[PDB]
Design an enzyme around this catalytic site. Structure first.
Site, short mmCIF file in Angstrom:
data_model
loop_
_atom_site.label_atom_id
_atom_site.label_comp_id
_atom_site.label_asym_id
_atom_site.label_seq_id
_atom_site.Cartn_x
_atom_site.Cartn_y
_atom_site.Cartn_z
CB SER A 16 -12.51 -57.95 -51.90
OG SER A 16 -11.88 -57.37 -50.42
N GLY A 17 -14.21 -55.93 -51.16
CA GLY A 17 -14.88 -55.21 -50.49
C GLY A 17 -15.54 -53.87 -51.89
CG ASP A 21 -14.77 -59.33 -54.53
OD1 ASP A 21 -14.84 -58.43 -54.01
OD2 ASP A 21 -15.11 -60.35 -53.08
CE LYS A 37 -13.40 -53.17 -62.25
NZ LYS A 37 -13.92 -52.00 -61.35
CG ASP A 123 -16.67 -42.98 -57.68
OD1 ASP A 123 -16.96 -42.59 -56.12
OD2 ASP A 123 -16.84 -44.25 -57.51
#
Ligand SMILES: N#Cc1ccc(NC(=O)Nc2ncccc2OCc2ccccc2)c(O)c1
Ligand SMILES: O=C1CC[C@@H](N2Cc3cc(NC(=O)c4ccccc4)ccc3C2=O)C(=O)N1
Ligand SMILES: [Zn+2]
EC number: 2.7.11.1
Lengths: 261, 802, 375
Positions: A16-17, A21, A37, A123
């Site tokens: 989460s976050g 999620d 997702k 990323d």
């Protein structure tokens, strides 16, 4: 209960976050554990379609998953894939906080595939690497392609012309010099900082720019094998990455399973 | 078409039963011969047999017995039909008129039950008190023989033993006692019971025994003063009477199985035995009041006998189904080994008819048939006038070649394995005594093998010109004579198969083309196929062949070879193949009818319609473009048609005609003018030797004949008082249905035999749609003219009695 | 199949060993029009004699089953030509012999075991207001045919028409020679009549099956031609159109012939999505259950799978860890198997828990994901 497309069932929460999620779905006709997702149609961050497209352009490999289903269900968009497993990060800090560099060439091999597949992930963090489950228990998988820049353009992949004064927050601790647009060199430079990893404030000019300037204040040799420190330097000089790979195989062999295994 | 007409050209010739006694009068010995639906009565004279009466029955005769109850002048006749009609008949003669009087009749069918696999058994006790019938497994039916039982009321008793082989009534018992042999998992046993009519139950029999041979099949009830029974098996002959036991195992009877018996002396001193090959034996019982020994001796060879009967002066009647029936004489002396038989009279039998053809239509056709089996096989030429050509082996298929003026016959003979690795013939046959002989290829215990041959026969002398022997283990299935392509030559084409005992389905076969020229037979071309060639037909200058389940069309190349044009694959075997124009009729053994058409432009086969109803089928034929004929299980005929009024209905064939013939049809042929208002002409040949004619009628004629048939049923007296409608009803174990679309020509032609007042009664109030146009009250004369015109479509039977 | 009990999979113990058992029959008469309810979720072709497990969740199905228990316990399983528009021409009647109900999780679940009885033809489908389907049904008959010789046989040999029982290649030679002796009175030879004899066809099927699967006990197959044909049709891993074709056949002899034709034509099971990769061969098929190599089982969410038990499978991918929950075969743990090419669900791999059992590894494959290849 939330049945994804009338075929899956979200049983619990695994991460989460995040933008999406990552739930654990279950096939009501097969019995397979599935990663889902889920993002809102009016969510602030619509990375779901982004990452699904990047998976689609990936289409195969030892580090890219398979998209079981995509589309949309009422107000919550959905992406169902194979259950990935545990993050490389959540294995390095859980275990204890040869294995490092054997994984590294697997990461190095992964990025050739993304670079040869005409785009960049951009990323790179230990969170975005995940070990497989079962047959894939020893194979690295790169995920979280929502923040991945696509170089596909007209005909052969054309790198977009560089534009100064750019911002980067996805790679909070791996931003490094990156005004300079993130590119192939920028991918592999974050990898060296991940290998190295293997005074904050609200103001960004102090929480990102100060970290970057301290990151490049001194040469890599003092911070660090110094030979692969200078490989990192000259990898950031960017063609060369095929050479960097053969050199890293040489280093792997010249050192006379992983941590948790 | 939708309305057909069935008539009998030749009555059945095969014998299924025969009895002796005093039926016509108490001072005359009578022989009663049972052929299919026909009962013939003869008086035994010194010269031979004198016919007195012949009658037709509305059923297939299954049981025929003669009994004399107390207080009766002469014998009475018990008849049971395959549809379970039971009658008791008397013979009455008032001057010239001779009639068969019905004393009692009824139907003894049980609504529930499965028919016994071993068949129907009917026995009458020597005291004339009851009738015992074995119709269904586990049940025994008893018919009391009191005077006031005219509906033949019967009751059932339960048999613990489900598999009964034979049952008989015993002599010399105070109560009606039966003896029977049954089979259980242990083996075969002999048991007795006593039948009480008051209690309607089985009592304990006088004796029980277990020592019965595993191949025991026949029970013989020995009269007084001996008593007991004789059990006939494959290896031993045994006599059981309470504590008495005698057994013999003569080596002379091991070769073949004994299938029939008859009694010579009134007291059981002598018996006649007959086997499957034609050997006649004598069983002799020695006496001191009590029995001493059993002896068996060989008398000679006769026809393959279904039944045997002794005629009280040394004359024996041999009733055959595979060949001609004989009257033989038993002599005290002999020629080579003691007590031989001498033939003195032969009676014609055309059954079984397995194939036939129509020849010489230029001017009045003739019928040539393949009749008989084993040593009784022959060719019959029918004009009725019949000529016999003995082949001494089994004829299978036949065709006619006009250019060569010869016949092509497929045959087979039985040879036994010798120690030398080869085969030896049992007798001289046609294929061994030909003018010229050829083989396909030369190759090298007590096991019987089949050798198949092709025979060429002259049409004038009917001698064998050339015999061709096929390969070892090769089974010849089809035969055609035709011209192919642009070739001006006529060929014999044979379709074979390779049959090995370890293989269930043949995987190899071939099609061979022969030419008969300048007195010799040569092989022109051979083609290897991967199946069995069940049928072949000529299709517009091409060859249509049925290999296993596929249908293949062949072309005749200028290089003298067969080239495949188109293939069509089905789910069924194409056992039956008929052709009319561009249409092909396909059928299998389970009554699956497929209609195909050849598309000349597209060069393939298209499916038009189908009909799938699971039942056993023996033959099919094409009547016209729309209607097709066939033969069903039991003994039935059916007609299907197409396009009667979407593609669901257009692709379905429905049944417009059903009929119960009573015969098993093997072959259909288009005998248009074999015997010189009706349309078309088709002949069929049966197992019993019966030849029939099927023609097509119009709506008006069908209606008129149906009304006349219904009126005639009310005035004609049947033997046993069986109803014609019940007799002609379509019969299957799962279904019974009235007949539709068929006119019974025998009943129609019976109209000419009735008296004039009965004709007046029949023709009363009948509206006749004459050719003038307006309907008027029909008179007997107009119907007489109609019936005579109908009889003109076939020959006329000769007089039977003197 | 050593130290393992073959009767365990038949009881379907994963549903509960405390069912309510119903004894009794209800056979409809041949060729009659009757109205029978249809369960809306079942997409299976039921062969008579086959066992069907069910778990029902929706309230309307629960009400229908509760009504059915008190009245003749028959519902209709329609063999759909294509499930898209829910149209079908033929079907089968299924009868309930086991039933239990649970109120777990605040909802109502009904568990049913059913057996197929009769084939029918669909005349009319009515979808009444409440939301279930009632169909007008004509009961198709079972065609029992006598011996082919019952039309040509002479009455004299009929006494010897019965033969001593079996003690066998010589015995079958004698059986053919003596049973079809009167074939010479017709136009066809003896072997053609043997090709349409039910006993001979059954013997050939048993020989083929024993050659493929040696552990096949002699008495595991029925002695009746109709039951034998139905069991063989149930156990054959074929596609829907072939099953419909077998369901349309009314005669046992034709059914046996069709089954032999299916068996003889070479077959290797392939993936349905790819149609290029081969999962298993017919040599590696074994019968871990009393029913045979294939049977119908139900999963926790009420989906019926037809599982084929094979010793070895190729080009399969295993996802997840061996889980022992709700296993159809007691004492085994299943892992999901996907095609190595199309990544579609083909079945599971079962690994045993103990070490004294046998076999320890085998595979189960669903019929809907398998396609038979015919060269
Ligand atoms: N009771 C009982 C019982 C009933 C039936 C069976 N077996 C079977 O039907 N087929 C079977 N079996 C074993 C090995 C191979 C087999 O064919 C494989 C196959 C056939 C046709 C097409 C494609 C593949 C049984 O083993 C027991
Ligand atoms: O032998 C066998 C029999 C059982 C069969 N299953 C098991 C299974 C579990 C599931 N998830 C569940 O219940 C489940 C578990 C936890 C939370 C929510 C749901 C889904 C489908 C299947 C399914 O089809 C199988 O896989 N193999
Ligand atoms: Zn696949």
């Amino acid at each position: 209960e939330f049945i994804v497309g009338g075929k899956y069932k979200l049983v619990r929460k695994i991460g989460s976050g995040s933008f999406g999620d990552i739930y654990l779905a279950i096939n009501i006709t097969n019995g397979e554990e599935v990663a889902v997702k889920l993002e809102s149609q009016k969510a602030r961050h619509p990375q779901l379609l982004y990452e699904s497209k990047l998976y689609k352009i990936l289409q195969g490999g030892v580090g890219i998953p398979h998209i079981r289903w995509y589309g949309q269900e009422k107000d919550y968009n959905v992406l169902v894939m194979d259950l990935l497993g545990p993050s490389l990060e959540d294995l390095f800090n859980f275990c204890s906080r040869k294995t490092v560099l054997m994984l590294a060439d697997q990461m190095i091999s992964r990025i050739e595939y993304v670079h040869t597949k005409n785009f960049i992930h951009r990323d790179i963090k230990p969170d975005n690497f995940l070990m497989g489950i079962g047959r894939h228990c020893n194979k690295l998988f790169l995920i979280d392609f929502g923040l991945a820049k696509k170089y596909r353009d007209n005909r052969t992949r054309q790198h977009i012309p560089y534009r100064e004064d750019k911002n980067l927050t996805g790679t909070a601790r791996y931003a490094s010099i990156n005004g300079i647009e993130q590119s192939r060199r920028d991918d592999m430079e974050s990898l060296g900082y991940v290998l190295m990893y293997f005074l904050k404030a609200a103001t960004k000019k102090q929480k990102y720019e100060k970290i970057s300037e301290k990151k490049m204040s001194t040469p890599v040799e003092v911070l660090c094998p110094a030979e692969f420190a200078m490989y990192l330097n000259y990898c950031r000089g960017l063609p060369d990455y095929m050479y960097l790979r053969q050199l890293f195989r040489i280093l792997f062999r010249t050192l006379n399973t992983f941590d948790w295994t | 078409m939708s309305y057909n007409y069935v008539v009998t050209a030749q009555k059945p010739t095969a014998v299924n039963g025969c009895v002796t006694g005093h039926f016509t009068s108490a001072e005359d010995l009578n022989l009663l011969i049972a052929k299919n639906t026909r009962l013939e009565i003869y008086v035994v004279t010194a010269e031979g047999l004198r016919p007195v009466k012949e009658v037709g029955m509305y059923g297939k005769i299954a049981v025929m017995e003669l009994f004399r109850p107390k207080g009766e002048s002469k014998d009475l006749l018990f008849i049971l039909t395959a549809k379970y009609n039971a009658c008791i008949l008397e013979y009455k003669q008032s001057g010239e008129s001779i009639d068969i009087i019905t004393r009692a009749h009824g139907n003894v069918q049980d609504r529930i039950g499965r028919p016994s696999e071993t068949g129907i058994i009917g026995i009458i006790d020597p005291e004339c008190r009851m009738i015992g019938l074995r119709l269904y497994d586990g049940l025994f039916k008893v018919i009391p023989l009191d005077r006031d039982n005219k509906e033949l009321k019967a009751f059932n008793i339960r048999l613990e033993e489900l598999h009964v082989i034979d049952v008989k009534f015993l002599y010399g018992c105070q109560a009606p006692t039966i003896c029977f042999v049954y089979q259980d998992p242990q083996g075969r046993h002999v048991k007795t019971y006593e039948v009480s009519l008051r209690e309607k139950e089985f009592n304990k029999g006088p004796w029980k025994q277990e020592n019965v041979e595993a191949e025991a099949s026949m029970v013989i009830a020995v009269p007084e003063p001996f008593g007991g029974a004789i059990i006939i098996g494959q290896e031993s002959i045994t006599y059981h009477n309470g504590d008495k036991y005698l057994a013999i195992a003569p080596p002379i009877i091991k070769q073949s199985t004994i299938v029939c018996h008859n009694r010579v002396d009134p007291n059981g001193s002598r018996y006649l035995l007959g086997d499957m090959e034609g050997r006649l034996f004598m069983l002799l019982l020695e006496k001191e009041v009590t029995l001493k020994d059993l002896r068996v001796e060989l008398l000679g060879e006769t026809s393959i006998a279904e039944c045997l009967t002794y005629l009280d002066n040394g004359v024996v009647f041999v009733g055959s189904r595979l060949g001609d029936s004989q009257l033989v004489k038993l002599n005290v002396d002999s020629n080579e080994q003691g007590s031989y038989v001498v033939a003195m009279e032969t009676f014609t039998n055309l059954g079984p008819i397995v194939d036939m053809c129509v020849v010489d239509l230029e001017r009045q056709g003739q019928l040539v048939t393949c009749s008989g089996a084993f040593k009784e096989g022959s060719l019959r030429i029918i004009r009725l006038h019949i000529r016999t050509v003995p082949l001494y082996e089994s004829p299978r298929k036949i065709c006619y070649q006009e250019v060569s003026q010869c016949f092509g016959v497929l045959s087979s003979r039985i040879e036994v394995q010798d120690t030398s690795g080869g085969t030896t013939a049992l007798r001289p046959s046609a294929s061994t005594q030909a003018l010229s002989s050829s083989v396909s290829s030369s190759k090298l215990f007590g096991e019987e093998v089949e050798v198949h041959n092709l025979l060429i026969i002259d049409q004038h002398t009917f001698e064998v010109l050339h015999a061709h022997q096929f390969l070892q283990n090769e089974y010849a299935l089809s035969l055609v004579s035709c011209k192919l392509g642009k070739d001006p030559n006529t060929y014999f084409i044979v379709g074979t198969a390779m049959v090995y005992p370890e293989e269930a389905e043949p995987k190899q076969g071939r099609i061979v083309v022969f030419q008969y020229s300048d007195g010799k037979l040569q092989t022109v071309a051979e083609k290897e196929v991967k199946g069995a060639v069940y049928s072949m037909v000529e299709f517009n200058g091409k060859l249509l062949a049925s290999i296993n389940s596929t249908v293949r069309l062949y072309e005749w190349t200028t290089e003298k070879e067969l080239r495949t044009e188109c293939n069509h694959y089905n789910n069924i075997m194409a056992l039956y193949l008929k052709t009319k124009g561009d249409f092909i009729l396909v059928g299998d053994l389970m009554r699956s009818v497929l209609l195909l058409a050849y598309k000349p432009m597209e060069g393939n086969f298209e499916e038009i319609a189908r009909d799938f109803n699971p039942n056993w089928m023996s033959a099919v034929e094409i009547l016209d473009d729309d209607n097709f004929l066939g033969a069903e299980n039991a003994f039935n005929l059916f007609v299907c048609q197409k396009d009667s009024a979407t593609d669901e209905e257009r692709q379905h064939l429905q049944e417009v005609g059903l009929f119960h013939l009573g015969e098993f049809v093997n072959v259909f042929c288009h005998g248009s003018l074999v015997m010189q208002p009706t349309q078309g002409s088709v002949l069929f040949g049966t197992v019993n030797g019966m030849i029939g004619l099927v023609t097509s009628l119009s709506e008006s004629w069908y209606n008129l004949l149906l009304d006349m048939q219904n009126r005639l049923n009310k005035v004609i007296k049947s033997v046993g008082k069986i109803e014609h409608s019940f007799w002609r009803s379509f019969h299957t174990e799962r279904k019974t249905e009235p007949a539709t679309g068929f006119i019974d020509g025998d009943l129609i032609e019976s109209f000419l035999d009735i008296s004039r007042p009965k004709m007046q009664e029949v023709v009363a109030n009948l509206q006749y749609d004459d050719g003038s146009g307006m309907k008027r009250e029909a008179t007997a004369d107009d119907l007489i003219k109609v019936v005579e015109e109908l009889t003109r479509i076939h020959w006329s039977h000769p007089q039977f009695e003197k | 199949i050593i130290n393992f009990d073959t009767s365990l999979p038949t009881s379907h113990t994963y549903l509960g060993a405390d069912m309510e058992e119903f004894h009794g029959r209800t056979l409809h008469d041949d060729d009659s029009c009757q109205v029978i309810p249809v369960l809306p979720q079942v997409m299976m072709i039921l062969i008579p004699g086959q066992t069907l497990p069910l778990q029902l969740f929706h309230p309307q199905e629960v009400s229908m089953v509760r009504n059915l228990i008190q009245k003749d316990r028959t519902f209709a399983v329609l063999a759909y030509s294509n499930v898209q528009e829910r149209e079908a021409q033929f079907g089968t009647t299924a009868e309930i012999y086991a039933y239990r109900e649970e109120q777990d999780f605040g909802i109502e679940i009904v568990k049913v075991k059913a057996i197929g009885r009769q084939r029918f033809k669909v005349l009319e489908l009515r979808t009444q207001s409440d939301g279930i389907q009632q169909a007008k049904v004509q009961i198709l008959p079972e065609c029992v045919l006598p011996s082919t010789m019952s039309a040509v046989q002479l009455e004299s040999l009929n006494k010897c028409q019965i033969f001593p029982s079996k003690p066998s290649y010589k015995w079958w030679q004698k059986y053919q020679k003596r049973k079809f002796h009167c074939a010479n009175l017709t136009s066809w030879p003896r072997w053609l009549y043997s090709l349409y004899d039910a006993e001979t066809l059954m013997d050939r099927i048993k020989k083929q099956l024993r050659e493929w699967d040696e552990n096949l006990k002699d008495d595991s197959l029925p002695s009746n031609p109709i039951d034998f044909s139905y069991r063989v049709a149930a156990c054959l891993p074929i596609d829907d159109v072939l099953r419909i074709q077998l369901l349309k056949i009314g005669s046992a002899i034709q059914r046996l012939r069709c089954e032999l034709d299916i068996m003889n034509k070479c077959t290797s099971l392939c993936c349905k999505q790819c149609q290029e990769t081969e999962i298993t061969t017919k040599n590696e098929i074994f019968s871990l259950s009393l029913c045979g190599p294939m049977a119908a089982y139900v999963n926790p969410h009420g989906y019926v799978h037809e599982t084929l038990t094979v010793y070895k499978a190729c080009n399969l991918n295993l996802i997840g860890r061996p889980s022992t929950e709700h296993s159809w075969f007691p004492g085994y743990a299943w892992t999901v198997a996907q095609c190595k090419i199309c990544a579609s669900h083909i079945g599971w791999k079962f690994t045993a828990t103990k070490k004294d059992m046998s076999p320890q590894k085998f595979w189960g494959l669903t019929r809907s994901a398998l396609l038979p290849t015919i060269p």
